[PDB]
């Protein structure tokens, strides 16, 4: 995709109305998510939605409750909002208490056990006494477990409908929510040669370890430009996480931009900066969309999103090589680093004119200069 393409939002139809989607938002063409739709029917006058992305699964409630939605994707708000649907920049577990007689959860298998469970909590938590819960997954990841701990929180549930591996129960609130779960980590690491303590909420890529890509790329990042060749100079991370490269970098002297679409991502990224006596700007933002038009950099740094067992490039990571392209000043040098064999090499040659490999072990780190 151009980058204009991959930051459009586009309309589809459905009976009665449209629903917009992009690239890079989560619940389009979902199993999970469309098994919900399939199921879900109003009850009381307010209900919320944990986990909507672009809100197909919630959908036929709206105009038959009043409908909020809490969302930690940017890409996912951008199309709520205009697909005119109520939604909130907010974690799951931000809901308020007691005030909900309807709560929609798609479960978020992908992030995890903890992140899951504090969601289920919230979800608990935000109901009233008698209040329902639609909770839909998938028995190949973790529903049964989910289901059990749902239904252990609140009272009776019952699958409501079924297709193939994908489940929606729907349980009654018939006891006292406990309170949140302990949600914030730290863990503490050495690189090149600075001690860095970590802070990160559930869900976050690479979850109480640097990931040895992020590290590879900084080793091969201070081999080519010398600890120095950092200072002073303006820097992007595509896609910071909690920090693993933009920690370093503004220790390193760099003036850094830390661009991540997942709000649990920027708030470890922001809590991590604090406890590091460290200075950065960490943006909620789909790829650059936060930036100005006419933001440039000296240095573009990335280990992009990567699909687990995939063979292809996600249309977020090829994003990322064109913005990092577009993005640098004359001069400007990017780095990324991914699995030995994912095809980035035509794309940094098409985009760059040419690119260089630097490592290749358990991970490479490619390079590229802008003409
Ligand atoms: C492989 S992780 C790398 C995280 C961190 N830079 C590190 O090295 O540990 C990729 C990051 O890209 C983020 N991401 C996914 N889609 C994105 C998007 N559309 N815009 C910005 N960041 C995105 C993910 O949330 C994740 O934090
Ligand atoms: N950072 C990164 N890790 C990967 C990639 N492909 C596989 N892995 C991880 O490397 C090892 C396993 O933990 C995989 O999940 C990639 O493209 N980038």
């Not at 056990?113 to 028995?139: P, W």
């Not at 650059?288 to 699909?307: G, K, M, Q």
């Amino acid at each position: 995709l151009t980058r204009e393409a991959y930051h459009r939002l586009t309309p589809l139809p459905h009976p009665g109305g449209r629903l917009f989607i992009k690239p890079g938002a989560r619940g389009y063409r979902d199993p999970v998510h469309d098994l919900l739709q399939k199921t879900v029917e109003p009850f009381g006058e307010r209900a919320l939605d944990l986990n909507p992305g672009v809100g197909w699964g919630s959908l036929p409630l709206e105009g038959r409750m009043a409908v909020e939605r809490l969302e930690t994707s940017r890409a996912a708000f951008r199309c709520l909002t205009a697909s005119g649907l109520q939604a909130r920049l907010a974690l799951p577990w931000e809901a308020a208490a007691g005030a909900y007689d309807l709560v929609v959860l798609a479960l978020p298998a992908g992030r995890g056990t903890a992140y899951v469970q504090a969601s289920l909590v919230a979800a608990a938590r935000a109901l009233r006494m008698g209040g329902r819960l639609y909770l839909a997954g998938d028995k190949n990841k973790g529903f049964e477990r989910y289901f059990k701990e749902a239904r252990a929180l609140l009272g009776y549930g019952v699958v409501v409908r079924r297709e193939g591996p994908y489940r929606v129960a729907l349980l009654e609130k018939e006891k006292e929510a406990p309170p949140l779960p302990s949600l914030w980590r730290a863990f503490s690491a050495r690189i090149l040669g600075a001690e860095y303590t970590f802070h990160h909420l559930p869900g976050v890529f690479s979850a109480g370890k640097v990931d040895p890509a992020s590290l590879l790329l900084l080793e091969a990042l201070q081999e080519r430009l010398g600890p120095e060749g950092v200072r002073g100079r303006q820097v992007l991370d595509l896609g910071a996480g909690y920090g693993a490269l933009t920690l370093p970098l503004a220790r390193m002297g760099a003036e850094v931009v830390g661009v991540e679409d997942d709000l649990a991502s920027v708030l470890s990224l922001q809590k991590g900066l604090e406890a590091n006596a460290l200075k950065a700007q960490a943006l909620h933002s789909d790829v650059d969309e936060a930036l100005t038009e006419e933001a440039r950099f000296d240095i573009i740094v990335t280990n992009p999103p990567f699909h687990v067992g995939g063979a292809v490039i996600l249309d977020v990571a090829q994003a990322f090589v064109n913005v990092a392209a577009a993005r640098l000043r004359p001069g400007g040098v990017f780095f990324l680093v991914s699995n030995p064999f994912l095809k980035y090499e035509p794309l940094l040659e098409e985009k760059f004119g040419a690119f260089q490999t630097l490592k290749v072990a358990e991970y490479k780190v490619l390079f590229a200069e802008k003409r």
